Design a protein around this ligand. Structure first.
Ligand SMILES: *[C@@H]1O[C@H](CO)[C@@H](O)[C@H](O)[C@H]1NC(C)=O
Lengths: 106, 198, 122
């Protein structure tokens, strides 16, 4: 099972309307997951089932999608969001990720 | 004189209680009851209860007295009231929006919660959907997270619908076992009987 | 919720290695444990994840059967035995906990991650 992301990388600024899409080779439904890793420490859960926003997290994050196409959306980008964001497959036990999308300043 | 006091000692004092999911269902019929002493006893941590007022509860009698008892962690004793939702409240035993009976609860820390851990009380934490009022849930069959029926291979993802309380003698007052009973009162078109001291 | 790892480092190819990961701050009887790998400066990849009650297990296709797992229920930890070392295995290794809630509540969900250990085969 092959998973893809778009864009591979981007450079943005504060408060931007950010949007990143993720495509699955086969219909997985909605169980896809969204993770982040900032430079230096442990990654944490952000979005699970592509429709649930993690507790203790700013509401500015948003997630949507179904079938094979899903998308994260950022209303107001913040200086702490310049990290590496990755997809996760929650389908049949062999599971992989996407290429990810590092968030850079512009 | 009273012909027979309504038997309450076997369920209030009692010797054992079932888990919340397989909760007992006791029926009470033509009789005379003494709820007044229930108010008198100070051993009840939270006698506060809904519907009819306790002082005049002894003057509008019914046909059916349905007494259901169980034990839980202390903190979610609040999860037994109309309208609220919660793990025990929603997945084990919920009450209708209206209600004509009411609840009682107290502490049993020394009776229960054996030092090495009783581990003899189970509660539902998964289910496919929400729960109808006053329905027993004896179903001891596998539940699935989704996308995979494990076909009785219990284990990975099969999520056995019974997780244990895991009591300990020093967990804290917020986790010590509490004994809860509920007395729902039902007024059927049949003549009412369950009223006592007069 | 804290995690500690040990057993990695610099090793020569062809030997056998062992990795331990322990955790505290929750009830370990649940929350099926998992392992993930990440080669430096390249996309990370999942490794393994087993069960709640040491039940049926699963592995990555690339390394299936070569490595093995153990759920230390007693001291709330997990063992991972590495066999037939390859230089490709050189990476940062993460032991990761799992949740119990949500919409579908899938055990493959990852959160409360630890720190990771560097492992080099050369
Ligand atoms: C439980 O036992 C005590 C001790 O005799 C008694 O005072 C109390 O009334 C009993 N509870 C009942 C009968 O509901």
């Amino acid at each position: 099972i092959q998973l893809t992301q778009s864009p591979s990388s981007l450079s943005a600024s504060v408060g931007d309307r950010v949007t990143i899409t993720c495509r699955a080779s086969q219909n997985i439904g909605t169980y896809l997951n969204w993770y982040q890793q900032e430079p230096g420490k442990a990654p944490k859960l952000l979005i699970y089932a592509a429709s649930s926003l993690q507790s203790g997290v700013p509401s500015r994050f948003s997630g949507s999608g179904s079938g094979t196409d899903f998308t994260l959306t950022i209303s107001s980008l913040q200086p702490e969001d310049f990290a590496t964001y990755c997809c996760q497959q929650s389908f049949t036990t062999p599971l992989t990720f996407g290429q990810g999308t590092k968030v850079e300043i512009k | 004189n009273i012909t027979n006091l309504c038997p309450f000692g076997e369920v209030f004092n009692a010797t054992r209680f079932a888990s919340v999911y397989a909760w007992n269902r006791k029926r009470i019929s033509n009789c005379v009851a003494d709820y007044s002493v229930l108010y008198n006893s100070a051993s009840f941590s939270t006698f506060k209860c809904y519907g009819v007022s306790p002082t005049k509860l002894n003057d509008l009698c019914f046909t059916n007295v349905y007494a259901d008892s169980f034990v839980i962690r202390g903190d979610e004793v609040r999860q037994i009231a109309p309208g609220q939702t919660g793990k025990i409240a929603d997945y084990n035993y919920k009450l209708p929006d209206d209600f004509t009976g009411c609840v009682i609860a107290w502490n049993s820390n020394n009776l229960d919660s054996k030092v090495g851990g009783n581990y003899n009380y189970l509660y539902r934490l998964f289910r496919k959907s929400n729960l109808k009022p006053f329905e027993r849930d004896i179903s001891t069959e596998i539940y699935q997270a989704g996308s995979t029926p494990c076909n009785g291979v219990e284990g990975f993802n099969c999520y056995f619908p019974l997780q244990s309380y895991g009591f300990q003698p020093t967990n804290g007052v917020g986790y010590q076992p509490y004994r809860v009973v509920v007395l729902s009162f039902e007024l059927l078109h049949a003549p009412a009987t369950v009223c006592g001291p007069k | 919720v804290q995690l500690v790892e040990s057993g990695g480092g610099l090793v020569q190819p062809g030997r056998s290695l062992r990795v331990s990961c322990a955790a505290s701050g929750f009830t370990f009887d649940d929350y099926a444990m998992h392992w993930v790998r990440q080669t430096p400066r390249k996309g990370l990849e999942w490794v393994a994840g087993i069960s709640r009650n040491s039940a049926a297990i699963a592995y990555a296709d690339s390394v299936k059967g070569r490595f093995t797992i153990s759920r230390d229920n007693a001291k709330n930890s997990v063992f991972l035995q590495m066999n037939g070392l390859r230089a490709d295995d050189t990476a940062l290794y993460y032991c990761v906990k799992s949740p119990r809630y949500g919409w579908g509540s899938p055990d493959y969900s990852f959160d409360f991650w630890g720190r990771g250990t560097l492992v080099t085969v050369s």
